[PDB]
Design a protein around this ligand. Sequence first.
Ligand SMILES: *C/C=C(C)/C=C/C=C(C)/C=C/C1=C(C)CCCC1(C)C
Length: 227
Amino acid sequence: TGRPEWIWLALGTALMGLGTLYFLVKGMGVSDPDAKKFYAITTLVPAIAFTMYLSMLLGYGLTMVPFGGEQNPIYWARYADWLFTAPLLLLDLALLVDADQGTILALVGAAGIMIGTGLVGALTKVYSYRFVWWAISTAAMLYILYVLFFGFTSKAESMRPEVASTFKVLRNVTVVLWSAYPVVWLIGSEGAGIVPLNIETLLFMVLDVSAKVGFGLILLRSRAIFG
Ligand SMILES: *C/C=C(C)/C=C/C=C(C)/C=C/C1=C(C)CCCC1(C)C
């Protein structure tokens, strides 16, 4: 096939794999229970992304959805990725500020809706309705971000400055990166079809890698992960 976006798929696979091994090696060396917890979660994130990026590279997770009078290429493998990686990243932040189970349940649930409606919209055949689902998915993300910024930040204040300061960084990187996904979707192949798939793939890999490996490097190198 040799699609124009394969090189970015290959780069995403490479970066996710390397980040996975590094976390794995670093994680199985630590003896602290709590640290192990964070390491197990943070290592699984890029591991899942690696498998999906590899699959897409190999030609899977791609489907032609008709709308706008075209046969549009929609990489659904991404949602198979985010469905598990998104909530896991949320869990890392939750464990960091000692969030409550109710909060975590609510966040993971909102994340489920976000990815769920997102995929449904990316698969919808009625052009205008694709944006209705997109809208609902974004509303769910805003809820998540609101909770992360107003709820979590507040409880991170009961933690030590080192833990609070580590969370602020992860929170910030998360808010900035996550906020970009809906925009890319809107102007990309799933939406207006303004930005070509090759470039679109480039944008998503940069966001995915930064939100997983970048997020992990920051979290796993901090002393805030220790019990
Ligand atoms: C490693 C992957 C991460 C951190 C992915 C985060 C993804 C989002 C915040 C995705 C959001 C979306 C919307 C707000 C609406 C349209 C569809 C999505 C799923 C692209």
